[PDB]
Design a protein around this motif. Structure first.
Motif, PDB file in Angstrom:
ATOM      1  N   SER A 182       0.814  -1.207   0.000  1.00  0.00           N
ATOM      2  CA  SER A 182       0.000   0.000   0.000  1.00  0.00           C
ATOM      3  C   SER A 182       0.848   1.256   0.000  1.00  0.00           C
ATOM      4  O   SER A 182       1.949   1.284   0.553  1.00  0.00           O
ATOM      5  CB  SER A 182      -0.998   0.039   1.151  1.00  0.00           C
ATOM      6  OG  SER A 182      -0.364   0.320   2.387  1.00  0.00           O
ATOM      7  N   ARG A 252     -14.095  -3.334   2.149  1.00  0.00           N
ATOM      8  CA  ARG A 252     -14.498  -4.733   2.038  1.00  0.00           C
ATOM      9  C   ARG A 252     -15.752  -5.014   2.876  1.00  0.00           C
ATOM     10  O   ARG A 252     -16.674  -5.709   2.421  1.00  0.00           O
ATOM     11  CB  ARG A 252     -13.358  -5.672   2.431  1.00  0.00           C
ATOM     12  CG  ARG A 252     -12.279  -5.834   1.374  1.00  0.00           C
ATOM     13  CD  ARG A 252     -12.680  -6.885   0.322  1.00  0.00           C
ATOM     14  NE  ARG A 252     -11.618  -7.076  -0.660  1.00  0.00           N
ATOM     15  CZ  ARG A 252     -11.283  -6.172  -1.579  1.00  0.00           C
ATOM     16  NH1 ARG A 252     -11.943  -5.019  -1.655  1.00  0.00           N
ATOM     17  NH2 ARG A 252     -10.277  -6.425  -2.421  1.00  0.00           N
TER      18      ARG A 252
ATOM     19  N   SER B 182      -4.149  -2.388  -1.116  1.00  0.00           N
ATOM     20  CA  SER B 182      -3.799  -1.098  -1.693  1.00  0.00           C
ATOM     21  C   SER B 182      -5.022  -0.335  -2.160  1.00  0.00           C
ATOM     22  O   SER B 182      -6.019  -0.923  -2.583  1.00  0.00           O
ATOM     23  CB  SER B 182      -2.786  -1.213  -2.826  1.00  0.00           C
ATOM     24  OG  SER B 182      -3.379  -1.719  -4.010  1.00  0.00           O
ATOM     25  N   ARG B 183      -4.919   0.986  -2.114  1.00  0.00           N
ATOM     26  CA  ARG B 183      -6.004   1.837  -2.571  1.00  0.00           C
ATOM     27  C   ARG B 183      -6.352   1.592  -4.038  1.00  0.00           C
ATOM     28  O   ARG B 183      -7.521   1.499  -4.390  1.00  0.00           O
ATOM     29  CB  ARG B 183      -5.645   3.300  -2.342  1.00  0.00           C
ATOM     30  CG  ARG B 183      -6.776   4.290  -2.649  1.00  0.00           C
ATOM     31  CD  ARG B 183      -6.475   5.675  -2.070  1.00  0.00           C
ATOM     32  NE  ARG B 183      -6.175   5.506  -0.662  1.00  0.00           N
ATOM     33  CZ  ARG B 183      -7.080   5.354   0.297  1.00  0.00           C
ATOM     34  NH1 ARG B 183      -8.384   5.474   0.056  1.00  0.00           N
ATOM     35  NH2 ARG B 183      -6.660   5.127   1.531  1.00  0.00           N
ATOM     36  N   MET B 185      -5.958  -1.105  -5.794  1.00  0.00           N
ATOM     37  CA  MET B 185      -6.622  -2.398  -5.912  1.00  0.00           C
ATOM     38  C   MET B 185      -8.103  -2.314  -5.554  1.00  0.00           C
ATOM     39  O   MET B 185      -8.955  -2.891  -6.231  1.00  0.00           O
ATOM     40  CB  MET B 185      -5.939  -3.426  -5.023  1.00  0.00           C
ATOM     41  CG  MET B 185      -6.588  -4.804  -5.054  1.00  0.00           C
ATOM     42  SD  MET B 185      -6.464  -5.655  -6.637  1.00  0.00           S
ATOM     43  CE  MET B 185      -4.696  -5.814  -6.814  1.00  0.00           C
ATOM     44  N   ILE B 186      -8.402  -1.571  -4.491  1.00  0.00           N
ATOM     45  CA  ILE B 186      -9.785  -1.427  -4.027  1.00  0.00           C
ATOM     46  C   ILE B 186     -10.562  -0.478  -4.941  1.00  0.00           C
ATOM     47  O   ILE B 186     -11.675  -0.786  -5.391  1.00  0.00           O
ATOM     48  CB  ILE B 186      -9.827  -0.865  -2.600  1.00  0.00           C
ATOM     49  CG1 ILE B 186      -9.069  -1.747  -1.588  1.00  0.00           C
ATOM     50  CG2 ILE B 186     -11.259  -0.653  -2.168  1.00  0.00           C
ATOM     51  CD1 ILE B 186      -9.515  -3.145  -1.435  1.00  0.00           C
TER      52      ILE B 186
END
Ligand SMILES: CCCCCCCCO[C@@H]1O[C@H](CO)[C@@H](O)[C@H](O)[C@H]1O
Ligand SMILES: CCCCCCCCO[C@@H]1O[C@H](CO)[C@@H](O)[C@H](O)[C@H]1O
Lengths: 301, 301
Positions: A182, A252, B182-183, B185-186
Motif C-alpha cells: 500500500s 471490504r 492497496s487503494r 486495488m480497491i
C-alpha cells in the motif's frame, strides 16, 4: 501535513532496538502519563479463558444503568501495552460512551505467540457476553481496539459470527493483515511514530511462521466472508502506514453489506487517541466513539 | 479521469465467465488486431528448457548490429496471451529500441501451474544470455514484460542475480505479489479492463496453494534482498488495480540502491501498451522503453 503539535512532539519507543522489557516500560510510562478521568467504579476481574486466566479491568460510568459493555483490546503490536497503560484512554472512553468498558489483558508475544492474543480476546468477549448481568450490562456488547488491538477486535468480530451478538465493532487505526504494497505503508514507513521496521519486528515476535500471515485470525482482510458482521466505526490516521489497509477493510465490509462509518483523521498519526491530552483530535475521536456507542446501546444522542 | 478515448472503448475479456479456450481466443483476436510494423527478420526458435522445449519468436531490427537482446514475457494473467498475440507489440518495441526482441512462449496455467512460467522464463533468459552470439546480440540482455509478464520479468531479474548479467528490467504495469489492501486495488477493482475478479481468477488458476502467495517467485515484493538487481524502468497506469503495488516495488528497488525510473501514465489502464494503435499513450510508453534500451545497450540517444 502533520499537525504542527504532532511534528513538534515527534521532532523532540525503541522497538527492535532495546529489550522487550525496556520497550514495554517506555511505552507504559508514555501512555500512562495521560490524565485519568474519574469514573464511578473500577474493578479488576479474572475471566476464565480456555488457555489461561484472563485479567481484565472493568470501568463503570457515573451514568445510571442499564449499560452496554464495550470490550476493549489494547494496542502495542501484540507485544507491548497492557490494561494499566491503557487506563487513561479507557476511562476517557467510559465517560464518552456512558457505558461499561472491560479492558482485556490478552497474552502477549513473544512469550505467547499467535494465536494466543486472539484466543484470549475471543474467550474474554464470549465470557462477558454470557455474563452481561454481572455488569448491569444488558444493553449488549461491543468490541473495540487500537492498532494491533484493532486487528484483534476485527478478528473477534469474525469469530463471533453466529455465536455472540456483538452490536458494534470499533476499529481504531487497525492492522488488518500483511501489507507490503500500500501507498501509506511505503510513504509513511518512517518518521511517524509507528514505522515499518517496528511493524516487521512485531510481526516477527507474534507470528510463528509465514503461514500465519495467511490465517484470517491475523489477516481478517482475506476472510472468506465478511457479511453479517457487526456495524463498524473505523478510524484511520492520515500519516499512518496502516491507513490504507484500514480503509481497505472498511471498503471490504461495505461491499459485504456491513454498515461502516470510515473516518480518516487528517494531520495525525497511528496511536493518536493515546495522545488525547496533547492531541485534541484524539479527544474528538473518543467523542465520535462515544456518539456511536450511545446510539447503538441506548438509542441516545 | 480516464482519457475519453479509453472510456469510450470500455463503455462499448470474459475472464472467469467463459472457458479458458474462449477467453484465450477473445484475447488473441483483440491484441493481434494491432498493426504489425515491419522488422528486418522474424525467426521462430526452440529453446531447450529444463522442463520443456520453449518456443520463442525472435525479431531483428532494420538497424545494423551489433544488438542488445530484450527478452519479452507477455502478459495475460499467467493463463492467456502468447507470442503470436503479442507480435504487434513486440514489433513496435523492436523498432523503438533498435534491438533484437525474443518473445518467450512460457508455459501457461491452468495446464501448467506456478512455478512453470517462472522456470521457463528464467531458462529462456539463461539460454539467450549464453547464446547472444547467435543474434549478433553482444551488446547484452535485458528483460521485459507486461502485467503477469512483468511479474515474471521481475522474478527472472531476481533469479538472475549472480548468474546472468541483465542490463535492464522493464516492468510494464507489473503484478508483484498478493495485494488485498492497496487503494488502487480497491478503488479500481471494477470497470477498468483488468478487474479484481479477473486477478483472483488468474491467481486461482496459476497458484497451487495459498503458500505460493508467499513464494518470492510469485511475490517479488517480499524478496529478502533486492539490492544488486538490474536498473529498472517501471511503468504504471493511473486507473489500474495493480498501480500501487508496481509503485511500491519501484520504491523498494530504489531503497535497495537499484536505479529506477518509475513513471505513472495518467488517464490510462492496465494493458494500455497492447492498445497502442488506439491509445497514443501506449505508443509513447513504447518510445520511452526505446529510449531507455538504446541508452543502455548502445549509449545512444
Ligand atoms: C501494529 C502491528 C502490526 C503488525 C503487522 C505484522 C505484519 C507481518 O509482519 C511480518 O511477518 C512475518 C512473520 O513473523 C515476518 O517474516 C516479517 O518480518 C514481517 O514483515
Ligand atoms: C495480472 C495477474 C495478477 C494475478 C495476481 C494473483 C494474486 C493472488 O490471487 C489469489 O491467489 C490464491 C491462490 O490461488 C487464491 O486463493 C485467490 O482466489 C486469489 O485472490
Amino acid at each position: 501535513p502533520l499537525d504542527p503539535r504532532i511534528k513538534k512532539l515527534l521532532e523532540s519507543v525503541p522497538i527492535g532496538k532495546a529489550s522487550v522489557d525496556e520497550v514495554r516500560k517506555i511505552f507504559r510510562q508514555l501512555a500512562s502519563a495521560a490524565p485519568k478521568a474519574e469514573v464511578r467504579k473500577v474493578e479488576d476481574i479474572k475471566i476464565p479463558g480456555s488457555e489461561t486466566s484472563i485479567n481484565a479491568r472493568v470501568y463503570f460510568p457515573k451514568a445510571k444503568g442499564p449499560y452496554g459493555v464495550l470490550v476493549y483490546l489494547h494496542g502495542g503490536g501484540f507485544v507491548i501495552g497492557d490494561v494499566e497503560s491503557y487506563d487513561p484512554l479507557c476511562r476517557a472512553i467510559t465517560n464518552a460512551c456512558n457505558c461499561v468498558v472491560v479492558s482485556v489483558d490478552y497474552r502477549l508475544a513473544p512469550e505467547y505467540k499467535f494465536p494466543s492474543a486472539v484466543i484470549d480476546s475471543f474467550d474474554a468477549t464470549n465470557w462477558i457476553y454470557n455474563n452481561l448481568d454481572k455488569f448491569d450490562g444488558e444493553m449488549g456488547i461491543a468490541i473495540a481496539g487500537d492498532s494491533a488491538g484493532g486487528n484483534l477486535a476485527a478478528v473477534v468480530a469474525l469469530l463471533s459470527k453466529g455465536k455472540l451478538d456483538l452490536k458494534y465493532q470499533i476499529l481504531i487505526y487497525p492492522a488488518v493483515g500483511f501489507d507490503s504494497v500500500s501507498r501509506s505503508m511505503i510513504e509513511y514507513s518512517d518518521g511517524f511514530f509507528l514505522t515499518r521496521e517496528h511493524i516487521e519486528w512485531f510481526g516477527s515476535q507474534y507470528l510463528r511462521s509465514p503461514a500465519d500471515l495467511l490465517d484470517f485470525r491475523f489477516s481478517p482482510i482475506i476472510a472468506q466472508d465478511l457479511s453479517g458482521l457487526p456495524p463498524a466505526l473505523i478510524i484511520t490516521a492520515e500519516y499512518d502506514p496502516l491507513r490504507d489497509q484500514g480503509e481497505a477493510y472498511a471498503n471490504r465490509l461495505l461491499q459485504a453489506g456491513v454498515p461502516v462509518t470510515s473516518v480518516r483523521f487528517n494531520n495525525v498519526i497511528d496511536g493518536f487517541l493515546s495522545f488525547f491530552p496533547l492531541i485534541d483530535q484524539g479527544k474528538d475521536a473518543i467523542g465520535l466513539i462515544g456518539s456511536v456507542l450511545r446510539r447503538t446501546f441506548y438509542d441516545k444522542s
